[PDB]
Design an enzyme around this catalytic site. Structure first.
Site, PDB file in Angstrom:
ATOM      1  N   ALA A   1      30.970  27.869 102.104  1.00 48.98           N
ATOM      2  CA  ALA A   1      31.074  28.271 100.716  1.00 48.98           C
ATOM      3  C   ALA A   1      31.582  27.136  99.850  1.00 48.98           C
ATOM      4  CB  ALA A   1      31.904  29.541 100.590  1.00 48.98           C
TER       5      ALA A   1
ATOM      6  N   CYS B   1      35.089  40.791  98.133  1.00 52.35           N
ATOM      7  CA  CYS B   1      35.577  40.163  96.903  1.00 52.35           C
ATOM      8  C   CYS B   1      36.917  40.656  96.403  1.00 52.35           C
ATOM      9  CB  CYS B   1      34.530  40.464  95.788  1.00 52.35           C
ATOM     10  SG  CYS B   1      34.921  39.646  94.218  1.00 52.35           S
TER      11      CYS B   1
ATOM     12  N   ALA C   1      28.968  33.763  93.479  1.00 53.74           N
ATOM     13  CA  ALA C   1      28.561  34.062  92.099  1.00 53.74           C
ATOM     14  C   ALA C   1      28.765  32.848  91.208  1.00 53.74           C
ATOM     15  CB  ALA C   1      29.393  35.249  91.617  1.00 53.74           C
TER      16      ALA C   1
HETATM   17  C1  FMN Z   1      33.080  30.713  93.069  1.00 56.13           C
HETATM   18  C2  FMN Z   1      32.942  31.751  94.188  1.00 56.13           C
HETATM   19  C3  FMN Z   1      32.197  32.882  94.063  1.00 56.13           C
HETATM   20  C4  FMN Z   1      32.086  33.834  95.130  1.00 56.13           C
HETATM   21  N1  FMN Z   1      31.194  34.873  94.993  1.00 56.13           N
HETATM   22  C5  FMN Z   1      30.932  35.577  96.065  1.00 56.13           C
HETATM   23  C6  FMN Z   1      29.884  36.577  96.085  1.00 56.13           C
HETATM   24  O1  FMN Z   1      29.106  36.721  95.112  1.00 56.13           O
HETATM   25  N2  FMN Z   1      29.792  37.336  97.197  1.00 56.13           N
HETATM   26  C7  FMN Z   1      30.609  37.214  98.363  1.00 56.13           C
HETATM   27  O2  FMN Z   1      30.450  37.971  99.283  1.00 56.13           O
HETATM   28  N3  FMN Z   1      31.549  36.247  98.376  1.00 56.13           N
HETATM   29  C8  FMN Z   1      31.679  35.427  97.322  1.00 56.13           C
HETATM   30  N4  FMN Z   1      32.525  34.358  97.429  1.00 56.13           N
HETATM   31  C9  FMN Z   1      33.284  34.227  98.698  1.00 56.13           C
HETATM   32  C10 FMN Z   1      32.625  33.146  99.562  1.00 56.13           C
HETATM   33  O3  FMN Z   1      31.350  33.649  99.996  1.00 56.13           O
HETATM   34  C11 FMN Z   1      33.451  32.787 100.806  1.00 56.13           C
HETATM   35  O4  FMN Z   1      33.539  33.908 101.742  1.00 56.13           O
HETATM   36  C12 FMN Z   1      34.864  32.381 100.483  1.00 56.13           C
HETATM   37  O5  FMN Z   1      34.811  31.364  99.476  1.00 56.13           O
HETATM   38  C13 FMN Z   1      35.615  31.823 101.675  1.00 56.13           C
HETATM   39  O6  FMN Z   1      34.974  30.639 102.236  1.00 56.13           O
HETATM   40  P1  FMN Z   1      35.611  29.193 101.957  1.00 56.13           P
HETATM   41  O7  FMN Z   1      37.113  29.316 102.047  1.00 56.13           O
HETATM   42  O8  FMN Z   1      35.011  28.427 103.138  1.00 56.13           O
HETATM   43  O9  FMN Z   1      35.183  28.717 100.591  1.00 56.13           O
HETATM   44  C14 FMN Z   1      32.799  33.530  96.341  1.00 56.13           C
HETATM   45  C15 FMN Z   1      33.570  32.351  96.468  1.00 56.13           C
HETATM   46  C16 FMN Z   1      33.606  31.454  95.424  1.00 56.13           C
HETATM   47  C17 FMN Z   1      34.485  30.209  95.549  1.00 56.13           C
END
Ligand code: FMN
Length: 305
Positions: A209, A89, A9
């Protein structure tokens, strides 16, 4: 192995999703869409939907009640072939509403929601979730999804209560017999992380992400590394061209004013480890004119080299 851009998001709008596909991402997701907001025809939710011609992009919806999720899914199914349910989330606002990762608090209620959504999603139904609400309950959660006919699952390997603290425990998915396409997520910042996450989880693919913000070339690097054991970093000229392309896509999709506001979120990533990036960021954070932003970024790069 498939590598997709996770939903984020505020970040993964059509311009960033497009940019990721231009660097080799295999698929992506819309920013989370409120099922209730969608049914109310809210302007904010309408702006988050992908275009129906936008390929390989899921419409991710969120909510706490089965009737709103199912109805939104039935209506979205008329135009979209892939609907994903956010069940991970940890954001306070979302969890307080009983949505996102709060759906894992009661797995009997989670099964109810998944069964009802399955009936309403005519195309591909996926679920993006976590290991459990406060403890690892992934075998049970996965069993619910497989039994209820979910087509694909994306798992950030942390519990909801951890939020972004602790570490992504990739090996937690190794116990799962992957009867449906299953993807790992969490702490994936480099190709080396991607390879280890795949190896420990035994998954069919992964999501990037935070690791992709301002670094869309990470998709190509990950594929290069998995195939050959080597990858390269972009040249300064390639960073500049990527920024320019991203900005052009932002202007086209959201207009000049909004493009500058949205681009501010990616500047730290694009300038990561570039001499004097901190000073440059400080100087450009309040610039409102898209042409001035573009010229300062160009000046910053060409001077770095
Ligand atoms: C700023 C932000 C917004 C997120 N919004 C969503 C979202 O809209 N839907 C979702 O399923 N996960 C959302 N995520 C989770 C990410 O999809 C991801 O699963 C999570 O950041 C873990 O991956 P990472 O540690 O490699 O960044 C969000 C993460 C971040 C940092």
């Amino acid at each position: 192995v498939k590598v997709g851009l996770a939903p984020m998001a505020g970040y993964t709008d059509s311009a960033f999703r497009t940019l990721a596909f231009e660097w080799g991402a295999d698929f992506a997701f819309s920013e989370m869409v409120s099922a209730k907001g969608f049914l109310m025809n809210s302007q904010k939710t309408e702006e988050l939907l992908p275009q129906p011609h936008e390929r390989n992009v899921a419409v991710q919806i969120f909510g706490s009640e089965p009737n709103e999720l199912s109805e939104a899914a039935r209506i979205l199914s008329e135009k979209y072939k892939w609907i994903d349910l956010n069940a991970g989330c940890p954001v306070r606002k979302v969890v307080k509403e009983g949505a996102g990762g709060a759906l894992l608090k009661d797995l009997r209620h989670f099964r109810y929601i998944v069964r009802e959504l399955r009936k309403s999603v005519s195309g591909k139904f996926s679920v993006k979730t976590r290991l459990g609400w406060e403890k690892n309950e992934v075998e049970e959660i996965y069993r619910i999804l497989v039994e209820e006919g979910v087509d694909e699952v994306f798992i950030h390997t942390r519990t909801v209560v951890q939020s972004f603290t602790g570490r992504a425990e990739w090996k937690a998915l190794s116990v799962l017999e992957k009867r449906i396409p299953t993807f790992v997520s969490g702490d994936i910042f480099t190709p080396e992380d991607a390879k280890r996450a795949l190896e420990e989880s035994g998954c069919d693919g992964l999501l990037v992400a935070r690791g992709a913000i301002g670094r869309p070339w990470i998709f190509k690097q990950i594929k290069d590394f998995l195939r050959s054991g080597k990858y390269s970093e972009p040249s300064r000229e390639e960073i500049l061209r990527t920024f320019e392309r991203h900005l052009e896509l932002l202007i086209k999709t959201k207009g000049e004013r909004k493009a500058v506001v949205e681009m501010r979120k990616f500047l730290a990533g694009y300038t990561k480890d570039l001499k004097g990036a901190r000073r440059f960021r400080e100087k450009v954070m309040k610039i409102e004119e898209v042409q001035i932003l573009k010229e300062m970024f160009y000046n910053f790069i060409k001077e770095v080299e």
